[PDB]
Design a protein around this ligand. Structure first.
Ligand code: HEM
Ligand code: HEM
Ligand SMILES: N=C(Nc1cccc(COC[C@@H](CN)OCc2cccc(/N=C(/N)c3cccs3)c2)c1)c1cccs1
Ligand SMILES: N=C(Nc1cccc(COC[C@@H](CN)OCc2cccc(/N=C(/N)c3cccs3)c2)c1)c1cccs1
Ligand SMILES: C[C@H](O)[C@H](O)[C@H]1CNc2nc(N)[nH]c(=O)c2N1
Ligand SMILES: C[C@H](O)[C@H](O)[C@H]1CNc2nc(N)[nH]c(=O)c2N1
Ligand SMILES: [Zn+2]
Lengths: 411, 407
């Protein structure tokens, strides 16, 4: 079966066959589309087919499909599964797997970069202190004094589900949030629950608006332990505007390194529950979502006040005006400090070129429109006009439940 | 089978049961989501008739009464006999309102119950269609205090006697390719514009020429009619702070009126069913004015603003976009022509969804269409999970008539 997608601005038509290799479910059926829903121990039985499918993919990519090395590797993995109930990936397979999970991430607009990913193998790690050391090294490498480099650090895989490695942080670097008795929030409201956990575990909270949270790290199914990232490794950018000199006095800043730490990486049926990964920001992530969401820093009013916009009616588009200025400020600030960032015009144009390249060489590129289209100025980016097909390929990044909801406390 | 949708801004969670009534298919499967794809007998008709009459009699709280049973028998008799049937006025009105209510791509459905239905099923010629259309235009425009309306022409019979409005909307602007290579006016309408010329329209070859109506009665060849200019309310576009804006020479029409869709009620097909409401400001300012393949004025406006167009990261496109949209709203508001901004329309839609979840068990909604084409995440609909499914009565797409028609 062939499926076509059209770009309605250019009339370019592309043909998808890669969807035929999809196994996992979408959430949709013939009677209902769930495309806007945010979230829609293995036995030997299910494991060897998953391992085989993955090794067949790996061996094809290196132009060795059906070779003696391919056949010997399948036999070796098969015996390892039936003897030990699991198996270990070779370094080369781990690298390929992590890169492909990114390549397959249908919600990711930055995938033109997928083949440039520094993979740190942390599968020899045994303790939380060991995890802290690996994570510091990743942060220092990825940061590279502002010239950001994409990276992933991969801790040991799941075994019986009772010895999981987990980073409890949603991101390696994030600001604390504090609910006040009067119901207001100091800092980032998205992180209130996690901040509370940290405090309970012994963190002394400075209680400011931009306090970098400590790492809360779980090795081998043990209780997690707190560590403070050395401040000298946390690169931050004060936010100012190129024309409006009062903008600096809003007291805003953000961190340069976006580093997701709560997802699960699936490669060949193996589950890596701690696999923090980092790249760099698209400007709207900070300026639209982090700053202007009502449930986040929520600065629109204060900015519109200072611009002296007409706030008596929504039809003045005061919110839209303030939004663009804040986003100009974020890009200006990062650029001025030589910290890598990409604007939403450049990022989406590159994604369209990536997607076309993937249709030609790979036969497809799964993409989630709801996520790929930026949260401002949607239709003046080329992705708004691009039809996309969403389907799930492995290797993959997946959601997993928050560890405080599942952890068995040892005491 | 019972499904939950969450608003991630407010934590409000709604439970959908209405999807279980859905009958038609979505395009998606368990392996592939096609949510962003723009277009995915006698024996056939009685179940469709019965399904509809069942919801109608339930709506007036007379489900399983003598009048309900008698109606089902009567229609059953009429299909057996004639191979089709006729809707009562009350059913036609209910069906049209529900076709809007069920339109999953429409952010304006809080209004669904206030629809004026003009029954044009007695119409027999293109001149008659022109008359009904003029009356609809005048009624809906209401000197700028716009009122929602639909005009329903005779239903399909054997399919060789179709009523069609060839126009995509009742009021739209001409598009012309030039030797120059550029496009004068609206590039979306170049092909239709040339069909009109081919049929004998005398185009003035300007930027904003209202197209003639091309009307097909009873499967006959379509005919041209100019809408009286006095019935076409237009708005010159100016900006409340920038004096040079008016120099761009921009205007738009007040009445959005879709004329190329098919209304399905109770298995019957109404292939000419022009409907109108009023504009959300972004339709004109973001899409009509700034789409690359439309009037595409972003460059010219940015220049008059003297923005740094060297680098995309200055957000010059974005700045220009906001100002164009401020101007569209200001112009309509100043001239007292109904318009709604994207903030107001999306807030109303969230209130409508809550009403429908409470009173009906759900509200089919297509997030890709409902979220406005600018400032998405600062509108509440961005944060609202939506389930999309197909209920009937419905509006559907149909092939353009020039590809079908036998001359
Ligand atoms: C290199 C620069 C990168 C940029 C500018 C980029 C940009 C983005 C953006 C804007 C999103 C949507 C985020 C949101 O709204 O919260 C996203 C999602 C995602 N990205 Fe990329 N990305 C990049 C690199 C990567 C890398 C290196 C990985 C993995 C190795 C990756 C995996 C993903 C995944 C798994 C998601 C979806 C998360 C979810 O479903 O919640 N990204 N990225
Ligand atoms: C009263 C004011 C109304 C407003 C402000 C409104 C707003 C909208 C908007 C903004 C769209 C998206 C259009 C686009 O992007 O091209 C839409 C789609 C739609 N609307 Fe409404 N609408 C209103 C009344 C109505 C009425 C009266 C009907 C039918 C009787 C209706 C049926 C639809 C349908 C069928 C679509 C989708 C068309 C498609 O899928 O191509 N609308 N509406
Ligand atoms: N509860 C909410 N959100 C939510 C709940 C569960 C899951 C999710 C999934 O999105 C999580 C998001 C934001 N927290 O993850 C951040 C993210 C993921 C991927 C890429 C991101 N940005 C990047 N640029 C990169 C990071 C690493 C490499 S590139 C940023 C979101 C809310 C929504 C609205 C208000 S609160
Ligand atoms: N070829 C393209 N698009 C396309 C092709 C086929 C079908 C479609 C579907 O969209 C049809 C759109 C306009 N194109 O219909 C207009 C419409 C429909 C419904 C509501 C609209 N606005 C209103 N406010 C109302 C009208 C009537 C009552 S309210 C406007 C779109 C293009 C994309 C970019 C430039 S052209
Ligand atoms: C490819 C994509 O589905 C297409 O560009 C859609 C996106 N969302 C839209 N939303 C609305 N309201 N109107 C449109 O024409 C479109 N176009
Ligand atoms: C309900 C809806 O799916 C949700 O708000 C989504 C919409 N699109 C998004 N797109 C991105 N990139 N990130 C997000 O968090 C979201 N949120
Ligand atoms: Zn779907």
């Amino acid at each position: 079966r062939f499926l076509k997608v059209k770009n309605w601005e250019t009339d370019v038509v592309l043909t998808d066959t890669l969807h035929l290799k999809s196994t996992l479910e979408t959430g949709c059926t013939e009677h209902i589309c769930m495309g806007s829903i945010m979230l829609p121990v293995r036995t030997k039985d299910q494991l060897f087919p998953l391992a085989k499918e993955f090794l067949d993919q790996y061996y094809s990519s290196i132009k060795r499909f059906g070779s003696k090395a391919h056949m010997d590797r399948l036999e070796e993995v098969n015996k390892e599964i039936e003897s030990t109930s699991t198996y270990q990936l070779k370094d080369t397979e781990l690298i390929y797997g992590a890169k492909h999970a990114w390549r397959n991430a249908s919600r990711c607009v930055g995938r033109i970069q997928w083949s440039k990913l520094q993979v740190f193998d942390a599968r020899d790690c045994t303790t939380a202190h060991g995890m802290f050391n690996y994570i510091c090294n990743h942060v220092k490498y990825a940061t590279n004094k502002g010239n950001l480099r994409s990276a992933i650090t991969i801790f040991p895989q799941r075994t019986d589900g009772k010895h999981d490695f987990r980073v409890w942080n949603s991101q390696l670097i994030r600001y604390a949030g504090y609910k006040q008795p009067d119901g207001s929030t100091l800092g980032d409201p998205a992180n209130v629950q996690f901040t509370e956990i940290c405090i309970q575990q012994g963190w002394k909270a400075p209680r400011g608006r931009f306090d970098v949270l400590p790492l809360l790290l779980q090795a081998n199914g043990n209780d997690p332990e707190l560590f403070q990232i050395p401040p000298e490794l946390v690169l931050e950018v004060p936010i100012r505007h190129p024309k409006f000199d009062w903008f600096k006095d809003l007291g805003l800043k953000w961190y340069g390194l976006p580093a997701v730490s709560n997802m699960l990486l699936e490669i060949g049926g193996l589950e890596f529950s701690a696999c923090p990964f980092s790249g760099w920001y698209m400007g709207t992530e900070i300026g639209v979502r982090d700053y202007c969401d009502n449930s986040r820093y929520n600065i629109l009013e204060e900015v519109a006040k200072k611009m002296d916009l007409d706030m008596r009616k929504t039809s003045s588009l005061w919110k839209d005006q303030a939004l663009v200025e804040i986003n100009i400020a974020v890009l200006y600030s990062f650029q001025s400090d030589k910290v890598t960032i990409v604007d939403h015009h450049s990022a989406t144009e590159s994604f369209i070129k990536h997607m076309e390249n993937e249709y030609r060489c790979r036969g497809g590129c799964p993409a989630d429109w709801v996520w790929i289209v930026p949260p401002m100025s949607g239709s003046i980016t080329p992705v708004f006009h691009q039809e996309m097909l969403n389907y799930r390929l492995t290797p993959s990044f997946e959601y997993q439940p928050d560890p405080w909801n599942t952890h068995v406390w040892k005491g």
